[PDB]
Design a protein around this ligand. Sequence first.
Ligand code: NA
Length: 503
Amino acid sequence: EYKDVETDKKVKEQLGELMEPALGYVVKVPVSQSGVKRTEISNPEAITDEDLNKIPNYEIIKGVAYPNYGELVDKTAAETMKYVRSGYVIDVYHSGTRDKGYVFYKGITPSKELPQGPALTYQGEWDFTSDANLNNEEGRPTALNDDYYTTAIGKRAGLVSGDAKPSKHKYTSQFKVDFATKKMTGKLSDKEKTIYTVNADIRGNRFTGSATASDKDKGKGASYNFFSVDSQSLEGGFYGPKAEEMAGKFVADDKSLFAVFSAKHNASNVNTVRIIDASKIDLTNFSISELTNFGDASVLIIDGKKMELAGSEFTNKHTIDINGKKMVAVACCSNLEYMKFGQLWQQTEKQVKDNSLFLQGERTATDKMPKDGNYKYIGTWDAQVSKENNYWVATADDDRKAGYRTEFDVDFGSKNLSGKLFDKNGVNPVFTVNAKIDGNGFTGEAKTSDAGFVLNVKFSDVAVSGGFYGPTAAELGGQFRYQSDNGSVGVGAVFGAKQQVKK
Ligand code: NA
């Protein structure tokens, strides 16, 4: 009597290779080997690290400069930022063909909640390394002992911002960000002069755009402008639980300059709506952890590496190898486009280590949420109930008749939600859910049958949290976890359901 609502597929926007999101990026300062005349900015290496106080490839440049009688200096902006770092680590007494250092940015906890209201002003700093260019036609200067500590400016080795004297140069960054229009503007300035202007569109908790140069004229000699070329590849992200901070980068179009930046807003009374759900329930501790997500629920991020969850069938298995070590995940479903839920474990031996459930979803815009209507949501769920050492496991399927089903009555009018979570070939539901709808989410309680559920296990009022996903809120997802005695009985469960149309 019910079938899935005809929905338009999620529009796939192909990025370009320099616009792939990550926790951070790092670039080795260009040093022209011999007898190369021009060494361009190489490809930015992605950072998969969640340690802020760790500078990328620090031990390498350290090991290079010191036996060569050099001294390291690092600007990471750790003195002012909480969730982000940006800047450099370079060799002050660099000469010759040995490595000079790195220019980078990184951040932790990409935002799942964005501010709501007026545009925000983020303030911070930016840094940069230039390409290396020996050619005399280029006309890069020699001996500007008033501006830089360095004799040959960007010739054998790139010009880093740390080579400049503070007496004459301060590189500041300022951005104005509207999360409503999902738009961003800003300026990268030296002292009071505007070097770059930046434009960007916000998608998820990332932003992609361009940096236009204020001074297009390259010039020559002591009047050489290292910031004449634009960049159509500015990419960054918001960090902090509520987009408290932001960091990013851009590479010049002719790869003559690579610039990084970090900034933070000071705003007083910031209201936040949620945009991203990404959670992981551990099926042993029954504790819950946040997953790193950038606004694509069909992509799971573990230890920094990327595993895509979408596939050709209803539920798809995907396997990836990370630092530790080989990870497997089963993801559902194929009819869900703005959310993904499933299982996630590590395949050590037959056995599984770190068994888990996960739920990701791209929240429905708070203004896109229906205010009137009464709908039906049919879907499925993954779960694990366990008293002592015997287990009951729910595994997502497409058997709408007699599988692990989830049925939901949703009234946007009264803002009420009810749900039934079934076992395979079960007439009466194992779990019943009663939740209240607020904004683009719902919070409520789950209870067993009034007589109990035997693997006997019985409990009432376990905290259930969920949300509506997609532009039309035609998809909903949720989760609940609980344990007693710490820990005798445990329950972990995640569910998903699609909006239905009759007949
Ligand atoms: Na503040």
